[PDB]
């Protein structure tokens with residue numbers, strides 16, 4: 001029942017319940033003349049919500065906030081962007097105007113600024129070394145090392161054993177590595193192995209794009225990246 005790309009018009013946002021107090025958000029966006037689905041995460045934080053990643057654009061992110069208001073009815077107070085690309089930060093200005101406190105690592109902020117992308121307000125220290133982990137509300141943020149991008153973070157929800165991989169993790173049906181322009185194809189398998197080692201109890205793995213599954217998404221991603229490399 002997870003929504004697919006052809007099921008979501010660009011500008012609409014769907015929520016999908018992953019576990020008690022954990023949802024993914026799914027949106028679609030046009031990029032270089034093709035339409036892609038994209039996931040983020042929502043985690044209940046008492047009587048508040050923590051958002052992971054924008055819905056890829058200003059209008060999509062306004063629609064995301066409206067969908068959250070309708071379906072969940074708890075305020076989004078903080079958001080974390082997991083890397084500097086537009087599917088993660090595009091819409092930060094909408095979040096900020098709506099009073100959401102926006103966060104990203106200094107690595108992500110510098111890359112977003114150099115790229116001309118929207119820049120989260122606050123800096124997340126303690127994530128600059130591969131294998132670093134910090135607590136942020138109801139999640140753990142983990143920097144696995146360079147993969148899809150040099151700054152990519154993953155997010156674990158310990159109460160639910162949910163791992164959100166962002167664009168460092170591909171769905172099982174993936175046959176291509178996506179946009180690798182900012183990737184480190186050689187380090188990516190090592191970064192995936194670090195995630196595997198750190199989160200062996202993950203029950204659900206959510207990719208940046210496409211269907212959630214189990215821990216197999218991690219090895220599959222390393223395999224996709226190796227096929228791209230040669």
Ligand SMILES: NS(=O)(=O)c1cccc(-c2ccc(C3CCNCC3)cc2)c1-c1nnn[nH]1
Pocket residue numbers: 031036085086087148167170173174175176177178179180208209
């Ligand atoms: N995050 S990004 O800016 O590099 C991006 C922008 C536009 C399209 C994409 C994009 C996303 C997925 C795909 C493929 C991956 C394999 N399955 C079909 C879609 C292609 C491009 C991406 C991306 N995210 N992760 N990897 N690339």
Ligand SMILES: [Zn+2]
Pocket residue numbers: 083085148149167
């Ligand atoms: Zn990206």
Ligand SMILES: [Zn+2]
Pocket residue numbers: 087167208209
């Ligand atoms: Zn992406």
